[PDB]
């Protein structure tokens, strides 16, 4: 009978691709339906270009796509409206914020699958070894701790040891890190939900100069080419005091044979001062049925299964990825495995979004300008002051005549 073909997640990032294919195969086995998994590149913006090839061709060759939180405004024409396939009570089992994110001009483009937010990973053993009893609350403290711990560990002979690793490659991940820097210095949201391009200000400038000041000092020079997995691999081998990353790194760090198993915790990212806002960029992925699927009914059944309570629970327990169902945050098994799901719930609830709603279908162009100008500051090519000014002008061009 039909073959239900799924493109979602990547075998190049942690266990997400492997686990995704396993779930899709379990749905196939359970329902007696043939399925195939199509693998994707690591980086979201590369996945977007890949999938856009299928969409442009109206291709029936993928039935189900895992789409980024930043995509609904872009991909809406390519999505089957799910709204008629769910009751109001079913829909309300998901967080309203994400359902709303996924709903474009009344169309429910996708079901919420897992959410994410940026967080600070930190080595507890190393903090204790150097006399610190809490992870840093401010960026200055992160720097001070990173310098002292690095000096010590280098002297003890770990020539691989760094203070801080993050995503500084020129891609969507840098847009994520950079929104956290700017917002946590009181510099705004780059583009505000009302359309105001606010990034040209002295706080945003300072946030970027500060990041520049990390490169080759407390962070490796090569951090300007790091995505999620490059940062994670330095961290996970035991070679970084701190890491900025998404929740999925926690379960990987705790796995049997991880050199850092039991040595780390997580907390909110630092901020410039006590009265700045906490910054955690909102991430996460959704499940879309293709408008070009020849098998909508079967594809919707697979998507409902993937987004169900027990599959999200498995995602939580085994891959430490955040559910999109409030009821899982009180589940005894989810919580015992990841107590920090409860500790940082308010951080996840206040996560700051990238400007995907306000930029809509032009978001990818906006983000590319953002990561290229930010990157120019990380490389030392421009100061923050010049970069935010150039960014403002580029975003103004990009969004001219665009209204939300
Ligand atoms: O790189 C930007 C991208 O990061 C996150 O996507 C992660 C995801 O959270 C992880 O579970 C795993 O799938 O790695 C992905 C990175 O390739 C955000 O979820 C996403 O919104 C963001 O655009
Ligand atoms: Ca994650």
UniProtKB/TrEMBL annotation:
<dbReference type="Pfam" id="PF01547">
    <property type="entry name" value="SBP_bac_1"/>
</dbReference>
<protein>
    <submittedName>
        <fullName>ABC transporter, periplasmic substrate-binding protein</fullName>
    </submittedName>
</protein>
<dbReference type="InterPro" id="IPR050490">
    <property type="entry name" value="Bact_solute-bd_prot1"/>
</dbReference>
<keyword id="KW-0732">Signal</keyword>
<dbReference type="InterPro" id="IPR006059">
    <property type="entry name" value="SBP"/>
</dbReference>
<keyword id="KW-0813">Transport</keyword>
<comment type="similarity">
    <text>Belongs to the bacterial solute-binding protein 1 family.</text>
</comment>
């Amino acid at each position: 009978g039909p073959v239900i073909r799924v493109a979602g997640d990547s075998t190049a990032v942690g266990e997400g691709g492997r686990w995704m294919k396993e779930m899709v195969e379990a749905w196939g086995k359970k329902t007696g339906t043939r399925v195939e998994y199509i693998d994707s590149p690591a980086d979201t913006n590369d996945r977007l270009a890949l999938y856009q090839q299928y969409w442009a061709a109206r291709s029936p060759d993928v039935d189900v796509y895992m789409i980024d939180v930043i995509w609904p405004g872009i991909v809406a024409p390519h999505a089957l409206d799910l709204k008629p396939y769910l009751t109001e009570a079913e829909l309300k089992e998901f967080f309203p914020r994400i359902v709303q994110n996924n709903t474009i001009r009344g169309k429910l483009t996708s079901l919420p699958f897992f959410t994410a937010a940026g967080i600070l990973y930190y080595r507890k053993d190393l903090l204790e070894k150097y006399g610190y009893t809490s992870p840093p609350r401010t960026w200055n403290e992160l720097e001070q701790m990173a310098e002292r711990v690095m000096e010590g560990e280098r002297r003890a002979g770990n020539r691989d040891f760094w203070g801080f690793v993050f995503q500084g490659k020129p891609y969507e991940g840098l847009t994520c890190d950079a929104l956290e820097w700017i917002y946590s210095h009181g510099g705004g949201r780059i583009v505000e939900p009302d359309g105001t391009i606010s990034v040209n200000n002295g706080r945003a400038a300072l946030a970027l100069n500060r990041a520049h000041g990390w490169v080759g000092r407390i962070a490796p020079q090569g951090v300007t080419s790091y995505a999620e997995e490059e940062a994670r691999n330095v961290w996970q081998q035991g070679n970084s005091l701190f890491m900025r990353n998404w929740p999925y790194a926690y379960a990987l760090g705790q796995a049997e044979g991880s050199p850092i198993r039991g040595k780390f915790g997580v907390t909110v990212l630092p901020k410039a001062s006590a009265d700045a806002p906490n910054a955690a960029t909102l991430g996460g992925w959704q499940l879309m049925v293709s408008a070009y699927s020849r098998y909508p009914k079967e594809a919707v059944d697979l998507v409902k299964y993937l987004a169900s309570y027990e599959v999200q629970k498995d995602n939580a327990v085994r891959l430490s990825r955040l559910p999109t169902r409030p009821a899982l945050y009180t589940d005894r098994d989810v919580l015992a495995r990841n107590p920090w799901f409860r500790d940082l719930l308010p951080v996840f609830q206040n996560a700051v979004s990238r400007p995907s709603d306000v930029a809509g279908a032009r978001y990818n162009q906006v983000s590319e300008a953002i990561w290229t100008e930010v990157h120019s500051v990380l490389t030392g090519r421009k100061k923050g002051e010049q970069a935010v000014r150039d960014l403002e002008a580029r975003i103004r061009r990009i969004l001219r005549h665009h209204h939300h």
